[PDB]
From a paper:
Many bacteriophages depolymerize the CPS of their host bacteria through their tailspike proteins (TSPs). We demonstrate here that the K1 lyase from the NTUH-K2044-K1-1 bacteriophage is a polysaccharide depolymerase that cleaves the CPS into oligosaccharides of 1–3 repeating trisaccharide units with the retention of the pyruvylation and O-acetylation. The structures revealed a compact, rod-like, trimeric molecule with an overall length of ~ 128 Å and a diameter of ~ 86 Å at its widest part. The structures not only exhibit typical features of bacteriophage TSPs, such as the central β-helix and the C-terminal β-sandwich domains, but also contain unusual features, such as an N-terminal collagen-like trimerization fold and a striking protruding domain from the β-helix.
The purified K1 lyase crystallized in the P1 and C2 space groups. The P1 crystal contains two trimers of the enzyme in an asymmetric unit, and the C2 crystal has four. Detailed structural analyses are mainly based on the P1 form because of its much higher resolution. Only limited structural differences between the two crystal forms were observed, with an average root-mean-square (rms) deviation of ~ 0.25 Å between all Cα atoms, indicating a rigid architecture of the enzyme. The N-terminal domain (Glu10–Pro70) of each monomer folds into a barrel-like structure with a five-stranded β-sheet and a six-residue α-helix, stabilized by three buried hydrogen bonds (H-bonds) in addition to hydrophobic interactions. The central receptor-binding domain (Ala71–Asp559) of each monomer folds into a right-handed parallel β-helix consisting of 14 complete rungs, plus an extended α, β-mixed turn on the top, where an eight-residue α-helix covers the lumen of the β-helix, resulting in a well-formed hydrophobic core. Succeeding the β-helix, the polypeptide chain (Asp560–Leu651) loops out with respect to the subunit longitudinal axis and is organized into a β-sandwich consisting of a four-stranded and a three-stranded antiparallel β-sheets plus a four-residue 310-helix. In addition, three pairs of Arg555 and Glu596, each from a different subunit, form three inter-chain salt bridges and three intra-chain H-bonds, constituting a triangular network that fastens the β-helix and β-sandwich domains together and firmly locks the three subunits. The “rider” protrudes prominently from the border of the β-helix and exhibits a β-barrel-like fold composed of two three-stranded antiparallel β-sheets plus a short α-helix. In the trimer, three β-helices are packed laterally through the β-sheets b2 and b3, forming a parallel, left-handed superhelix with a triangular hydrophilic channel at the center. This superhelix is stabilized by 72 H-bonds and 18 salt bridges at the buried inter-subunit interfaces.
Numbering used by the authors:
A (entry chain A): 10 to 651
B (entry chain B): 18 to 651
C (entry chain C): 12 to 651
Write the structure that this text describes.
């Protein structure tokens, strides 16, 4: 039974015995056990004394308020299997490394303030790539459950990881840097027969790993099962104290790293220029890792940066304000040598971005199986969403007030897919997939120069309004890009006092006959449903089927007399030869409703359009129904389409 | 008795027993007594020594718990059954967490609120120095007009009216923002905000800004308010958890029960959870039973609010975004950016999921309403979006708008056995995309907009009902495209309501599946003169006798087929006939232009046989011997 | 004070007033008591004269306990919160009771007994011991049920279990499982000899007196939270260390399982073992599994059966299991069974290398939905529906050995919305058993993109399918063909299969199919495949499809009432049984209006037949007028 009023008194005491009950009072107080066994001093949980060590007695988490200084915190977390609650405002003077099976948790008022003297990383979760590789014993196709190596070449330990690579190029996107393939897999079974060890993986392979590509495998060092609960890195007012950092949380070769909530603020001054590499959270070669609920303010580079062969990565519920990209999947520069890995299986869901300096949500030109679900970007300085890898899918995303395009692909990028996405008041376009096609399904764009820019693919369903030039702009990024077939079907693209329905860009080589337009609502555009520019000669129109161009004077019944009737109706057409125009006429569907013996074959002719000045009256447009039988007196139903 | 003890000295080492007691320190420094972590004793105070959370079991009384929570930076674990006699206020950077056994029983002597999380409105406003349009990252005020501290909040308002919906009360705009940057130059202070402005804030509307005192960063973990059996004890409350001017309030799981008797009448204002002027706040997983008013009420300028995974049973609305009555003076704020996801409602006394007539960017995703006494879902603000929601057995409509409300959007929503209709957007248009309605009087009631895709069955009157709430509402164009609305022994495909002035020519019907309806694909009532029909393009009406090949003899062939039409003049009917598509398959020199005539329909005496209906293909060339493929559409 | 526990518990003269401390392992403060206590050797110890109780606030810790037996004893009561901060070696089932939480630190584990395969965690209520008849019919949607006054005592906040002889109606129900539901009492009143019991949730079947509808009081285990359960560990198979069921729940309410890892009740990649599911929910309500990972499981990852209602499975990863998720039937071979799942959500789940279907139901269950789930490398299907009207939203199947998505014998109309199927061997979607609704889906890399006997294929996109994109067929010839709408589908030629294959062998009538506004570009004369017809069948109705991309719109000027137009007009006019007779729809619109304007028609369709490669830029048709003087300019558009 030994009681001490302060730390210095306790640690100077020379008479401790192992059977003693020991108590410290004050801000780091607690109960202690004396031992002679060599213990790792950290001045919070272990203290040196004459004759041995004092060990704080506790179950559950450790608390930062137990520690004398930052140095001790770093020492404590240098070991695995730690649970530390940050319940004080810590002043960092070095990087804090976190090891396997560890949790760092913050209370409402816990903080790590970075060092104002030197910009450095705050939290590191750092594994490493293999130092040596062995060849696969045989090719392993995509979908393989097992890989094989020569017996004894590699220690395969169940529950640990392997890192596979080859010279095959990443294939998710254009991959302009020529990044090579890699994947991280967990060993779940092992068997050896005939000199070959067969290693069963948790997940199957997503590329063909071939010996002709020097397919090989090594053992990485992973940091696994790290939880960061409510990390609070820096604090508002940081810019008045010149207090910054580089990367907030940097992970490399981590597995099951889960980041929940928290706030990461201020590795640049508010509203200031971007700073290369200064991402808030960076996942490099991480597997089964997540960021859920974290908020980001005033970040020099990306909110969450995902690169290398990061696989089964998810970002949910983040709010990112004044950052370069809220989320960016990244490439790796091969300027200085080979690099390996693209992200595979990425989900961003229910995330919000405000005032990004570049695209709200971004990929670079590699990555596979990338999905964004119910994300929203507001007031981007560039695009709301930018896809640079192929076939990125967007489900129910929204972009508001982007300086350029709500959603866009980019040079050489193939067919992003937009489903029920909504674009409002983006300056240039709602959707810009004019670089290499797009699939635009049930989307809406309102308040742009053009609702969609597209060179080929499909615009199916959806609704477009308040677009000053046209609702759909068939164009290219550059003239060299190939136009492909474009279907526009079931789209509501009515006239609302603004632009035309569809703009064909002759300037860059658009052939309108590669477009087909079926069952669209183009009501109100009259003779001005199309905009054309840059044509040297009048081009042939798209195929057009059962579109709606007018809402009045569009169905009725006529009675022939002597084989003919004149019908007043909003029939329409252009019969001129002006180069930037189409020659076209309404499709008038005729059906016979009485059946005299003089019934003949019916046709539409004599289309006249009222050109009263200054205001034309389309209700005095007319056409003639003529029968091949000059005695025809049939009643004929008529319907006017485009 | 520890507190009555005469002679404590600072050095003295201290222990309170009693299984919920502990270790203590003496001090003379002034401390706030709560009889749980701090006690007055002659000469000074005893402070409990602990790290991590406090526990309710440490406190002698509810009043001590209240005093403890009256300060910010508190973490309290409720590990006992607490008997409230006053409101528990929670302040910033605080957590209230309940164990499996912890509970707050409401005050039995006074029905009152249980939890309050209450910030305050600004005490003074200053005008904006310049117009700030929607999308503005910065606002300006005269230098020295107020002190804007980075990390703190601003409350902006003007006389511009909220614009999310009809706004019949004339609620004015407001928003709450966080200061992230401040610069002063040339007598103007420019304040950079976390999030951009969502309205124009104009000097002409007396745009102004003040500093609210927010309660920020509160977490309520598994709140258990009241318990089953409460009604036998006559133990109720008014509002369970009331928050105003809060930021980052997060409520997780828990159960809130019983501010009315089970199945009893509603009580105005008795919401389980109320969010007024709250930002970045959420309710996830909570369960609600026997609530007099709304499960989660959301009002004022609440922005970026989410409700996930709740279950609400015997409540007025599970979720309701609200208006504010301006009868006694101006009010400010509509909700902006609201998500309800994966929520369930049972036996609501009014709509399952609701808005009033203001609110912007409101979305409901995979929510479900069962057995509502009114609608499953009610939109009273404009452009509410519903994704994959479901309504079962509502007493009126599965999904509905209301008077004056524009264009709800329904995407892949499903309506089953709702008495009146699946979807009722007859008040001001609707967009009904790939939806389904089964088991109603009418699948969809709609005055204008779009019904695209989807599938309709078991509707006794008709699948689609083109009508209005009142004859004075405008009919607008209606597209009906790609809809499956087959005959299944019940109603017709489309009902045109002449009584309220519906002009069928404003309707267009393309590529729908109307198989089986025969001559009775349309219902019409209230027409005094036969109306002109909708445009119709390549719909399916029959599945048999609908494609073949005919050979002309002397320019003619008679073809048996399920061709159909009505040629009469009855006011409540359409004159129409099949679209028969003809294509030539052989190419004699006598090939002429082709036409359909002599449509005849069988009228056998018990049941007509449409396989014996016929038409004639006639050529303009009297010697034509062409083979002609024919296909029958509506 | 003491220092080890033989030492503390040997002490012969404890009295109630003593202040006691154990130093070292499992250390803390204690007090003495003479009241009968449940010895657990962690929080309660027997001592000369009575018992020592550990003093603490908040959770207990497994590090406090001398052995597994004590852990089991502690958790045998309700209202327990235990943190597993050690590696526990199980030798018996751990039962968990109401209002309890079992939480694991990253290193905490339960290692199963290597000597005997048994269950690890049990959360076990019980069915009623007695039932009483309903006093009146209670239709679906009822809020209240009635019983004779005094027949049963219904306590607010407790539960009821309702059943009748009516058969479960979610699917084919080949075992004849009967209906049941679990409901919570929220109100009770009695009048005129009848007790009316108000329920939390409404009834989802008609409960009729003619079906012997009855109700009893089950004993539920309620409010159990399992935080990060870690069951078994990698390398278990080297120690022959297995189990049967990992977490088995029956008659539980508000059981919530968060994260954790369950591994190894079979050897890696070994044969399935009947019944050895990782998690099993039987007759559970308002219960969830979120985040859990599963490896090397003999049966199902999550098994859901009985009248489990309002069950959700989110965010799981399952690798080397029979099914990741399976809703189950109950065999009635030895007697009557009751209950089908009602209201089930699977969201954001991932399956790899399942030995059978990735995500599964058997032939009962109502209101089943899978959202954003993904199956990789299934040895059977990615997704299998055996109950009626299972809905799939934005789900993905990759490289299944059979079908990406499939129904099965006697199963009606699964619904696929925006689902994606890649490189599944046989098909992307196989709903050829009983119809399907295939909406905006994609299938790439299969023998056939979709196999279907009736229903709708609407929208979507199909590529790289070796036989055809759509296969109109049946499982067996006895299955009914119903109408099939194919509309708005992109099913272009890309060097692989045809657009649509009509299976005459099983009696497919092509006229029951309608094809409108599809993109069939590139297929030329080979847009259909037919087999097993003995007589040329009549084709589907076709409306405004795209078959060619070049030579498909122009303007012709008639001369003497005719113009020859070179265009990619197409048709087949032969009689070969496995072929259709058909021709392009050429839409004609007059652009000039001479007095000699007559009615227009297409004739003389001529198609180049150069060997080995035909040149369709040499195909032609003639526009002919009824007026031999017609000189009209005529717009022409070529469709299928």
């Amino acid at each position: 039974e030994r009681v001490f009023s302060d730390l210095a008194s306790m640690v100077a005491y020379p008479n401790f015995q192992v059977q003693d009950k020991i108590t410290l009072l004050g801000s780091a107080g607690g109960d202690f056990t004396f031992t002679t066994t060599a213990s790792v001093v950290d001045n919070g949980t272990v203290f040196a004394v004459p004759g041995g060590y004092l060990l704080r007695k506790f179950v559950g988490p450790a608390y930062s308020s137990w520690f004398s200084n930052w140095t001790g915190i770093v020492t404590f977390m240098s070991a695995p299997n730690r649970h530390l609650v940050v319940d004080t405002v810590l002043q960092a003077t070095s990087v804090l490394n976190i090891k396997s099976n560890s949790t760092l948790e913050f209370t409402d008022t816990g903080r790590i303030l970075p060092d104002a003297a030197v910009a450095r990383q705050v939290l590191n979760i750092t594994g490493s790539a293999p130092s040596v590789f062995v060849p696969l014993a045989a090719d392993a196709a995509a979908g393989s459950k097992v890989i094989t190596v020569a017996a004894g070449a590699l220690s395969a330990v169940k529950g640990t990881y392997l890192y596979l690579r080859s010279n095959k190029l990443c294939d998710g996107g254009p991959n302009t840097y020529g990044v090579k393939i890699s994947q991280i897999r967990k060993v779940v079974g092992v068997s050896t027969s005939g000199g070959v060890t067969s290693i069963r993986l948790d997940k199957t392979l997503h590329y063909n790993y071939y010996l002709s590509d020097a397919a090989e495998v090594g053992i990485p060092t992973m940091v696994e099962n790290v939880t960061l609960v409510s990390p609070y890195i820096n604090e508002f007012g940081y810019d008045d104290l010149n207090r910054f950092f580089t990367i907030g949380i940097s992970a490399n070769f981590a597995a099951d790293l889960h980041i929940q909530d928290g706030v990461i603020i201020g590795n640049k001054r508010p509203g200031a220029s971007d700073i290369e590499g200064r991402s808030a959270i960076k996942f490099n070669n991480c597997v089964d890792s997540t960021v859920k609920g974290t908020c980001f303010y005033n970040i020099g580079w990306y909110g969450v940066e995902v690169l290398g062969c990061s696989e089964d990565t998810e970002v949910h519920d983040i709010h990112a304000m004044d950052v370069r990209h809220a989320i960016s999947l990244n490439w790796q520069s091969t300027a200085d040598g080979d690099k390996w890995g693209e992200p595979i299986e990425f989900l961003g869901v229910n995330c919000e971005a405000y005032s990004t300096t570049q695209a709200g949500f971004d990929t670079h030109d590699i990555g596979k199986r990338v999905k964004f679900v119910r994300c929203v970007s507001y007031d981007s300085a560039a695009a709301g969403f930018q896809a640079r890898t192929n076939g990125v899918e967007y489900l129910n995303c929204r972009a508001y007030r982007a300086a350029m395009d709500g959603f866009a692909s980019n040079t050489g990028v193939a067919f992003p897919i937009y489903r029920e996405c909504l674009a409002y008041d983006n300056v240039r376009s709602g959707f810009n997939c004019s670089y290499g096609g797009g699939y635009v399904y049930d989307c809406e764009a309102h308040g742009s120069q053009n609702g969609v820019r597209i060179n080929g693919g499909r615009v199916k369903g959806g609704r477009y309004t308040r677009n000053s030039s046209s609702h759909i702009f068939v164009t290219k990024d550059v003239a060299e890009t190939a136009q492909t077939s474009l279907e526009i079907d079931g789209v509501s693209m009515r006239y609302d006092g603004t632009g035309r329905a569809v703009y064909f860009h002759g300037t860059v080589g658009i052939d309108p006959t590669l477009v087909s337009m079926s069952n669209n609502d183009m009501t109100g555009h009259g003779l001005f449903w199309a905009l054309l520019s840059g044509y040297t000669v009048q081009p042939t129109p798209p195929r057009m089927s059962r579109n709606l161009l007018d809402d009045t004077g569009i169905r009725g019944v006529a009675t022939l007399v002597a084989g003919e009737a004149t019908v007043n109706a909003r029939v329409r057409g252009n019969f001129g030869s002006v180069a930037n125009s189409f020659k076209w006429v309404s499709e008038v569907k005729l059906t016979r409703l009485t059946f005299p013996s003089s019934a003949g074959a019916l046709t539409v002719t004599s289309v006249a359009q009222n050109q009263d000045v200054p205001t034309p009256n389309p209700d005095l447009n007319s056409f003639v129904i003529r029968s091949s039988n000059a005695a025809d007196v049939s009643q004929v139903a008529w319907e006017v389409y485009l």
